[PDB]
Amino acid sequence: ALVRRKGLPGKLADCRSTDPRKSELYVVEGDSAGGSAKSGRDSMFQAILPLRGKIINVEKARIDRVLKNTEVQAIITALGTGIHDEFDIGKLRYHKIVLMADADVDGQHISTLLLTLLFRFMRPLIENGHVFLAQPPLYKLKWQRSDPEFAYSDRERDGLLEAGLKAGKKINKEDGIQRYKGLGEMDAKELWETTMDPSVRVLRQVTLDDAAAADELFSILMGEDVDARRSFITRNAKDVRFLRIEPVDIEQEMQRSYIDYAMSVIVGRALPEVRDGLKPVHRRVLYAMFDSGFRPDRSHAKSARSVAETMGNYHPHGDASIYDSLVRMAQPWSLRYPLVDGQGNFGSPGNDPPAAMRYTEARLTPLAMEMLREIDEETVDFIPNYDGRVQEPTVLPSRFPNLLANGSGGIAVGMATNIPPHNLRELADAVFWALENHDADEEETLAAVMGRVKGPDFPTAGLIVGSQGTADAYKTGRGSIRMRGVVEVEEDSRGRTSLVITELPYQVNHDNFITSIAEQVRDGKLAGISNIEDQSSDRVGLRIVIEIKRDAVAKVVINNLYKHTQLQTSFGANMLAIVDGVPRTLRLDQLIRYYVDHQLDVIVRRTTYRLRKANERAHILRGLVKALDALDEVIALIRASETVDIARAGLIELLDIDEIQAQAILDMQLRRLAALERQRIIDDLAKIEAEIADLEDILAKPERQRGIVRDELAEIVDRHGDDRRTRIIA
Amino acid sequence: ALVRRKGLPGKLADCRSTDPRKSELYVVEGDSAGGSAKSGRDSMFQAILPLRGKIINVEKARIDRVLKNTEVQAIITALGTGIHDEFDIGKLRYHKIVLMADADVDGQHISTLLLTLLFRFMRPLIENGHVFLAQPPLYKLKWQRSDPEFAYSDRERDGLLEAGLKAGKKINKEDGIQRYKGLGEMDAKELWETTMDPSVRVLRQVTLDDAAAADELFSILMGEDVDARRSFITRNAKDVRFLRIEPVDIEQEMQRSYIDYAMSVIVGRALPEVRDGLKPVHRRVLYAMFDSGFRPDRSHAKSARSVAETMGNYHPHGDASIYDSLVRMAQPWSLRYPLVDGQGNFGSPGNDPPAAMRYTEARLTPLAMEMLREIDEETVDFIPNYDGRVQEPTVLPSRFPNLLANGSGGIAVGMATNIPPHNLRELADAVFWALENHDADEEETLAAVMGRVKGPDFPTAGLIVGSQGTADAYKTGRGSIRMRGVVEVEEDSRGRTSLVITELPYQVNHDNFITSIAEQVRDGKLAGISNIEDQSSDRVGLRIVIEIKRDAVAKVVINNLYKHTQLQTSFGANMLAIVDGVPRTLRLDQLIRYYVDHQLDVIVRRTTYRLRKANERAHILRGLVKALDALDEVIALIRASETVDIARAGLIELLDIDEIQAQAILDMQLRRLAALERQRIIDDLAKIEAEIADLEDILAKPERQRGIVRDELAEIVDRHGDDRRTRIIA
DNA sequence: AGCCGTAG
DNA sequence: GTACCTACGGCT
DNA sequence: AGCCGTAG
DNA sequence: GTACCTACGGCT
Ligand SMILES: *[C][O@@](*)(*)C1(*)(*)(*)=[C@@](*)(*)[C@@](*)(*)=C2(*)(*)(*)N(*)(*)=[C@@](*)(*)[C@@](*)(*)=C(*)(*)(*)(C(*)(*)([O])[C@](*)(*)C3(*)(*)(*)[C@](*)(*)[C](*)C(*)(*)([N@](*)(*)[C@@](*)(*)C4(*)(*)(*)=[C@@](*)(*)C(*)(*)(*)(F*)=C(*)(*)(Br*)C(*)(*)(F*)=[C@@]4(*)*)[C](*)[C@@]3(*)*)C2(*)(*)(*)=[N@@]1(*)*
């Protein structure tokens, strides 16, 4: 018998029962889900404690930081047991602690973080079987005239769909299945009937078989040893798809949930695809904008519309992250070749953030259209979106080599990518060589491409010092590239010397840079500086003026700035990309080859598509010419026919043509019987037959395929290619 | 010479100049605009202080609230002069204080609030001519291949457009001209070139002619006397559109800006239109959803998409307010007849808020479709949206009497509306009478309608005590309607008496209600209560159980609850609506009549539209029959014709038909020459001619018009009408 | 501990 | 992932 | 000093 | 209108 809420957490919706043995606590992902849960629960014995998203990983955090965490405090207070040596099982307020997170890999992650907290801070709760996982449904199958059905697995969804269709139930396979990605999507009634009703619900009870084994696993998964974690996930993620209260071992739960999360982050969030150089968020935003018709030929659209359309139809995630991605693809200091044309305040290279998406407007850039060129000609694979309503492309055609041109930065689980941007003309040269020397071996190709791709070309210009770092990156996929800002020495009328900083290394925050100098001068770490002034403007660009003391040597001050500030920084190149669904550290030659392979695939697919469409068209045109030759009998037959169907059958017989051709004749407008229009049909047939011949020739001759790739890339480079900004010095 | 920051406001971007005479401070609406301004300014002399939206009205505000206001503190600190008796002009940091707010009525409002602050707290700044208003452009004309042009007036926009077109410049008919609603829409360069460059900018200098007159005006506009303000706006809003440094008198500026804001809020934000009962936000959301195809026949769409589409194409305001409006129209406890069908967490009648719009899904209700019925048949007026890209309806057809059915609540400037919801069947009865007794005078109509509309019918059910309040509201437009919750007396197994509260008055927050009782028991204001328990569930609804002491009398406790809690509350009826663009307090008879008038208008317009379309169709069909009669000559002519154009001209001559008919013949598919298809054209002509006759008869006979209105409303009531929830007791 | 870039 | 601040009016 | 609903 | 909290990794 323990007191209930009428100094416990404010956000906690407690139960009426004082008996811990009858009382249940649902720890719920966010306040949205918390609301549904609170409204749907039996308040007699079900308590609801909503959290603020990703709770602190207590494995990595100092105990002081963990105890200061508001979410951790709330959990400890709610449970009432205390922690570690002060842990008292007798004071437990709820004998069933139910973790209820969203039916997504992030939810799984939050579960893993919570289980880590309970294991490290309150182990006896797991030992004594007080910790449960709720199993909310993944899918709601909406039938016409029949009650909706709930599926808790992809397999179950497919099974129930097939069973319902066999039973004569009508769904709508497009919008028929709703995929719950967040508990906030379920109403209180649905949540109760599926997840919270003791009569219906399924709870997975967390068990602890081997404390020592569990201890080791938690260290690997949640600890600071990145290498151990990376190795754990590589060896096990291979075969994890094979590994009412249902018992589940904590070790197995942690392994499954964490590996699911890790692989999701790696293969489908944080890292670029080698062929188009796009993270999934980027691809979805650009395709959504394309499908919405936000093309360079039309007027800028409110950023909000693009974000909303993307979010609603694809990327089933937060609006902030989608908007941020969109903003970054619009920033000319972030991307060497922006993919979004922004109108309004898209932020500063300093600490000024972008305006709200309600104020900003955006559309695709001409270059972005080259990423999406002929996407409607089966040039790439399409898959069903998260819920299966619409189709989305797996990769973009990417007629421009975006991965190397724009680079990619990303933090995955147990790994990161950091690919620098490059000059389009240099990359094109490399591609042209690879096309011409298709049969060159790896060594020859590497040598050739390294000779043409001189190094990173950052949007912020500046200097690259030395070639070693670049060479290492190109040969191994890893390298330290030294970047330097540009300093000009100016002497004033009275005889004083000033350093003018005009260019900063890539990803250096202008404001933080200035503040850092000021701090260093204050601290006495930078000497010989009398005055520092920001004279930067829209009209003149970056102009930071550092006045040197009369006794100070300019060169000495410059060297100290290189040593003690981001005026000189190193770009840690890690050329990691997804290749055939696998993360790979790649050499420069490999990256070029994978791009070339993709472009060849695109041309073959485009040509195959066009050939099929040409044949379909030619088929119709042949039918029309037959009709035109027997025009009088055709018209007479149609007029004599009682029904369209009789006419159709009569035409098939009269002209020895198929259903498709007969229909096309029936669909011919009277305007087409004009002399010129008749001639046009004849001419169109001749032209299409010529096209068919050409398309067949392209398919037959790989040299023509390579030629097409070369010519079309050359066109893009002619129109969109630009001068190198970054200067390379010895 | 004053110090510049390298204890001043964090968000302030100060200037380099220490000379107040050369230094300028731009006080900017929000951080978005602040960013653009900061990036575009000349940092030598131009300081930027961004604010957090609507700064506190110091005229109304308690000194405690004023002193706590972070924005007010920031301004005082920035200027450095102090306030009132401690005001020191010599310490002024910037001799030019430039107010830069968004080119919208809200921006005008913020200006008025800032001018109120300066007048009350720092008057000498206005006296000495230190206060200026920035004048940004209204329009950006986007040319292809040519630099954009900026217009500061509608006349200037039109002039520049015509000049550019004469000069051979190409614009874009589909969003060539952008209407700036927010400074965040302008990039740094645009803002500088238009608004901040001393060489180009226009500043309006605020002057103070008569301190006493100004003092009185500020009291009227910004003070607590609502009646004085209401009277000021009614008399003056009539003729306010008639009343490089340009001087502007503070009195004139305040009057113009405040009246503009007030009228915008009154006529186009806070109050319903009498004909459809919709505030503009409601109309725009429902129409946006309609135009997007989010109909009851299709699958729920993510709330975000609806909000974004609404925001982007119409309602040029914050996403939070749009979403909140959408959520409220989905809440069955908020609306007697919900217009939005929500899926997911749309909040609770208590303190649980709705889930984020990224989780919730929404579509129109069947009843909402009755609001929008035949909107595509010129049944209502359309006007250009805020920027003129798209057309939007002024009012909805509203085939259901939404204003009275759903009610309306809103706070305008110097006024408010509070119309209670009513029973659809009762309202329909009233409408039917008004239709039948079209010529009845006001007195007769009032008597008749009051007899049929028994009183408010709240979504929360409960009780209405007495008829007086209802009668007053119906006769005057103002009334106090007493609402009461429902209490059941239950006796438990041990012999104790409990009060079970099952229904609460309209707009009573369930959680606050419970908390209020607990507080009153604690305070000793409620005696005889032993225990209070919330036994409410999704399955059983509202069930608050109050256990009474053995010595306590149930009836006494109930009466005390009615006295000291919202168990009994009064609905303050204020039946205020926009009639022909004017806010009007209306009687019940007037409200019914205005609705009936609207429905008659709709039927006449629909019939007129259908007649026109019928005639157009008949015209084509007549042409086709002529062609069918001379089929051989028609086909022969077309075949003999070199071009379609020659054929068209030949047909006009051969058949004595017009261009439209000739084209229709040319567009006829060969399938239509089948016997049945030919007959169908003949039959279609006969049918359409019958339709034309009927439509003409409807236009001729107002009795048929009233009949149509009656019948169609009756159909809606049959399908969507429901039982009275609210019980009326003596 | 604090910087980046998609996530809660 | 979450939580306050304000203008407006009319009751408490 | 605080409730409500479209606005910053 | 605005401002923090966190996971993830790899440099500082
Ligand atoms: C901003 O600031 C801030 C501060 C603090 C806080 N806290 C809590 C919460 C919050 C929030 O609210 C913020 C914001 C709001 C809004 C959101 N969203 C927006 C949007 C969305 C979507 F979906 C769309 Br389509 C749009 F358009 C918009 C964000 C966040 C805060 N805050």
Q: Establish if B668 touches chain A: CB-CB under 8 angstroms.
A: yes
Query: Which helix (DSSP H) or strand (DSSP E) does residue A258 occupy?
Result: helix A250-265
Q: Write out the two tokens for B679.
A: 């007959």
Q: Which residues contact A86 (CB under 8 A, 6 or more apart)?
A: none
Q: Which residues contact B38 (CB under 8 A, 6 or more apart)?
A: A348, A352, B13, B48
3-state secondary structure of B547: strand
Asked if the Cβ of residue B572 lies within 7 A of any atom of strand D, the reply is: yes
Cα separation of B172 and B170, whole Å?
A: 7
Cα separation of A136 and A194, whole Å?
A: 6
DSSP result, B342-379: EES----SSS-PPPPTTT-EEEE-HHHHHHSTTGGGT-
Give the other-Cβ count within 10 Å of A395's Cβ.
Answer: 19
* Residue B491 C-alpha, separation from nearest chain A C-alpha, in angstroms: 20
Of the candidates A477, A459, A478, A704, the one whose C-alpha atom is nearest the C-alpha of residue A594 is: A477
Cα separation of A660 and A650, whole Å?
A: 14
Q: Which residues contact A303 (CB under 8 A, 6 or more apart)?
A: A323, A326, A327, A342, A357, A358, A360, A361, A362
- Helices marked H in B574-674 — which ranges? 588-629, 631-640, 644-655, 659-666
Name all residues whose Cβ lies below 6 A of ligand 1: A 304, 307-308, 319-320, 357-358; B 304, 307-308, 319, 357-358
Distances (CA, A) of B402 to B329, B371, B399: 12, 8, 8
Whose Cα sits closest to atom 26 in ligand 1?
A: A304
Residue B467 per-residue DSSP state: S
Query: Which helix (DSSP H) or strand (DSSP E) does residue A204 occupy?
Result: strand A203-207
Pairs of CB atoms within 8 A across A/B: 247
Query: Which helix (DSSP H) or strand (DSSP E) does residue A499 occupy?
Result: strand A497-503
- Residue B499: burial class (beta carbons within 10 Å; 0-12, 13-18, 19+): buried
Q: Which residues pair with A364 in a beta bridge?
A: A340
Q: Which residues pair with A100 in a beta bridge?
A: A28
Of the candidates A145, A171, A220, the one whose C-alpha atom is nearest the C-alpha of residue A388 is: A171
3-state secondary structure of A458: coil
Residue with tokens 């649980």: B352
Cα separation of A41 and A165, whole Å?
A: 34
Strands B149-151 and B139-141: antiparallel
Cα separation of A212 and A324, whole Å?
A: 43
Q: Tell me if A548 sits within 8 A of A497, measured CB to CB.
A: yes
The b-or-e profile of A413-432 (16+ CB within 10 A means b, else e) is bbbebbbbbbbbebbbbbbb
Distances (CA, A) of A136 to A42, A152, A258, A569: 17, 7, 19, 49
Cα separation of A673 and B666, whole Å?
A: 9
Of the candidates A154, A159, A152, the one whose C-alpha atom is nearest the C-alpha of residue A137 is: A152
User: Which residue in A has a C-alpha nearest to residue B516's C-alpha?
Assistant: A6
| Resolution for this experimental structure (Å) | 2.8
Q: Establish if B536 touches chain A: CB-CB under 8 angstroms.
A: yes
- Residue A205: burial class (beta carbons within 10 Å; 0-12, 13-18, 19+): middle
Beta strands in B447-543 (DSSP E): 463-465, 478-484, 486-491, 497-503, 529-534
Cα Rg, chain A, nearest whole Å:
32
Distances (CA, A) of B106 to B49, B55, B128, B199, B691: 18, 11, 27, 28, 51
Q: Tell me if B261 sits within 8 A of B109, measured CB to CB.
A: yes
A670 contacts on B by Cβ (under 8 Å)? 634-635, 638, 665-670
Residue with tokens 């001419």: A683
Cα separation of B189 and B167, whole Å?
A: 25
Q: Which residues pair with A310 in a beta bridge?
A: none
A293 contacts on B by Cβ (under 8 Å)? none
A78 alpha-carbon distance from chain centroid: 37
The type of residue at A128 is: N
Distances (CA, A) of B604 to A408, A479, B189: 63, 77, 53
Of the candidates B379, B373, B395, the one whose C-alpha atom is nearest the C-alpha of residue B276 is: B395
- Helices marked H in B147-302 — which ranges? 154-166, 188-191, 211-222, 226-236, 250-265, 280-292
The reply to whether A506 belongs to the active site is no
Give the other-Cβ count within 10 Å of B667's Cβ.
Answer: 12
**For chain B, what is the total number of helices (H) and then of strands (E)?**
26, 26
Cα separation of B237 and B221, whole Å?
A: 13
Q: Write out the two tokens for B159.
A: 């002039």
Cα separation of A551 and A560, whole Å?
A: 16
Give the other-Cβ count within 10 Å of B1's Cβ.
Answer: 6
Residue with tokens 């020397």: A437
Q: Which residues pair with A13 in a beta bridge?
A: A48
Q: Looking at beta carbons, which pairs linking B679-685 to residues 24 or more positions away fall under 8 Å?
A: B681/B621, B681/B624, B681/B625, B681/B628, B682/B625, B682/B628, B684/B621, B685/B618, B685/B621, B685/B622, B685/B624, B685/B625
Closest protein residue to D11 (Cα–C1'): B572
Q: Tell me if A149 sits within 8 A of A165, measured CB to CB.
A: no
Distance between the alpha carbon (CA) of B409 and the C1' atom of E4, Å: 9
Cα separation of A446 and A434, whole Å?
A: 10
**For chain A, what is the total number of helices (H) and then of strands (E)?**
27, 26
Q: Tell me if A79 sits within 8 A of A23, measured CB to CB.
A: no
Q: Write out the two tokens for B410.
A: 């809103």
Asked if the Cβ of residue A204 lies within 7 A of any atom of strand C, the reply is: no
3-class SS letters over B386-428: CCCCCEEECCCCCCCCHHHHHCEEEECCCCEEEECCCCHHHHH
Directed axis angle between helix B105-121 and helix B250-265, to 10°? 140
Cα separation of B433 and B410, whole Å?
A: 30
Q: Write out the two tokens for A299.
A: 């007027």
Cα separation of B50 and B12, whole Å?
A: 7
Beta strands in B86-125 (DSSP E): 96-100
Cα separation of A435 and A662, whole Å?
A: 46
Q: Write out the two tokens for B537.
A: 């569930």
Give the other-Cβ count within 10 Å of A591's Cβ.
Answer: 27
Of the candidates A366, A283, A277, A290, the one whose C-alpha atom is nearest the C-alpha of residue A322 is: A283
* Residue A41 C-alpha, separation from nearest chain B C-alpha, in angstroms: 7
The type of residue at B463 is: L
Asked if the Cβ of residue A420 lies within 7 A of any atom of strand C, the reply is: no
Taking the stretch 303-342 of protein chain A, residues with Cβ within 7 Å of any atom in nucleic acid chain D are: 318, 320
Which residues get their CB within 7 angstroms of nucleic chain E?
A: B 29-30, 52-54, 102, 104, 106, 269-270, 279-282, 315-318, 320-322, 324-325, 328, 334, 409-411, 507, 509, 512
The type of residue at B721 is: G
Q: What angle do CA A700, A702, A707 make, to 5 degrees?
A: 120
| Largest distance between two CA atoms of chain B | 109
What method was applied to determine this entry? X-ray
Of the candidates A638, A625, A673, the one whose C-alpha atom is nearest the C-alpha of residue B648 is: A673
Distances (CA, A) of B347 to A37, B299, B353, B356, B357: 11, 21, 5, 10, 12
User: Which residue in B has a C-alpha nearest to residue A177's C-alpha?
Assistant: B299
Q: Tell me if B249 sits within 8 A of B209, measured CB to CB.
A: yes
